[PDB]
Ligand binder design. Structure first.
Ligand SMILES: N[C@@H](Cn1c(=O)n(Cc2ccsc2C(=O)O)c(=O)c2cscc21)C(=O)O
Ligand SMILES: N[C@@H](Cn1c(=O)n(Cc2ccsc2C(=O)O)c(=O)c2cscc21)C(=O)O
Ligand SMILES: [Cl-]
Lengths: 257, 254
């Protein structure tokens, strides 16, 4: 409706959403910059909606209580306190049962963060061996995937990183990067994050194809009239190659040898 | 409830099961897509009859804007689902409803092993090694419409000389890679299926132009959300990974 302004829930995450810096006072949506803002601007332009960006108040993506209770941007959608979530919000089984997702505007998975010029080319290569230690941030989506996987190779990798846990499982992504940087360690991690780090640590590389295929989708409340239009606009933008440039724009470092 | 599912003959998604005796109905077919179908059938609780798309097309538009293929069968409500490697695309999604992708892919390179070529850029910066795509296919289209300069450069190369670098179809392209110093740009799934069966070939570089296959339904279908969710379940159960490995794995390339 022409009257209505859509509330867009989102979350602070480099480089999707960041407070912008400026020599002049900023207001409203203008206070933010980033990939997700560009995406939003493009979607708004195509669909004709006006929007109002609000950080999710608990600052979480959206997970479920041991007691079936949701938080994060997911909870905002369920309660119709937001019309859209535009953020690196992973499409998953549990989430898709409580809210509606547009098709992925970004497609990703788990990948390997490691050094250059080694025989290592895949998870399989990692799994087939023990001399180079590999792992994940403790209790991350990446680690959770391995823990829960019924796929032989991954089952083997989990046994590995759980067996060496004090070593193999790191506190957070920062410490994990340092491990790769400081040790003969390979870090499994959400591919997009790996790609960001790679553009800024010239002696790091992203190894292998993508494991655990998944996408980021714009979240909507079940039944939302906008979801379908948003899928179409996303595809339009992929068609025009515009998503690739947006990715490029916000992921690019300042050069790498 | 019984659903009509349109699909299309395609290795290794849909194939004639080989048997000494006569086979009937759904039992005639096997492949990655019949496995997915059975698997979504069990989660959603539906019966289905597999119907090969009569014109044997995926689905595209005339200059009039008339559709064909499985896409047309959906628009006309002659199928309830299309379960096949149907690429989710902008123009298709305007006329049919897609589930979220059960397989993600992109464009990659098909070449021989043991050369220094590691990327499209390595191919682009050079002329001894010929490279191309199938004429009029999605790969060519992508390359033709691309504003990325490396790709613009590759495109000018491919299309030069009455397009001697293009080929009529992927079988011809495959053979050309096999018998000639020639690299083939193509849909990565088919590339992987080929490398599994030609030990001296490989995929060069990574994926470009990300995209995915979804189960098509007619606009407004109640099955779309239910299949999306079944697809996510199967992904998390790791069943998609197993289905993929089952049908893609060759006989070992030692
Ligand atoms: N997409 C996620 C949020 N999310 C996310 O989980 N991770 C993964 C992660 C974060 C700390 S450890 C860890 C791991 O994978 O081991 C991201 O890297 C990320 C970048 S943008 C949004 C992200 C979501 O929808 O919940
Ligand atoms: N997904 C497509 C159908 N389709 C497809 O286009 N290609 C690629 C291709 C075929 C001839 S040229 C060409 C190219 O990449 O240049 C496939 O390899 C494929 C494997 S299963 C379904 C497939 C569709 O929805 O129309
Ligand atoms: Cl962290």
């Amino acid at each position: 409706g022409a009257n209505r302004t859509l509330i867009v829930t989102t979350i602070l995450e480099e480089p999707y959403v960041m407070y912008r810096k400026s020599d002049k006072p900023l207001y409203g949506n203008d206070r933010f910059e980033g990939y997700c803002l560009d995406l939003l601007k493009e979607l708004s332009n195509i669909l004709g909606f006006l929007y109002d960006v609000k950080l999710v108040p608990d600052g979480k993506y959206g997970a479920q209580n041991d007691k079936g209770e949701w938080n994060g941007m997911v909870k905002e959608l369920i309660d119709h306190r937001a019309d859209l979530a535009v953020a690196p919000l992973t499409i998953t089984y549990v989430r898709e049962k409580v809210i509606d997702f547009s098709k992925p505007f970004m497609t990703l998975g788990i990948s390997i963060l490691y050094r250059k010029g080694t025989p290592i080319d895949s998870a399989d290569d990692l799994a087939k061996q023990t001399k180079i230690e590999y792992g994940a941030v403790r209790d991350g989506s990446t680690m959770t995937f391995f823990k829960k996987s019924k796929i032989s190779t991954y089952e083997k990798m989990w046994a590995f990183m759980s067996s060496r846990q004090q070593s193999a499982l790191v506190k957070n992504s920062d410490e994990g990067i340092q491990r790769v940087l400081t040790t003969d360690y390979a870090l499994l991690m959400e591919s997009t994050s790996i790609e960001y780090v790679t553009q800024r640590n010239c002696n790091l590389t992203q190894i292998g194809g993508l494991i655990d295929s998944k996408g980021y989708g714009v979240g909507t409340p079940i039944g939302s009239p906008y979801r379908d239009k948003i899928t179409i606009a996303i595809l339009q933008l992929q068609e025009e190659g515009k998503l690739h440039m947006m990715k490029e724009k916000w992921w690019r470092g300042n050069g790498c040898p």
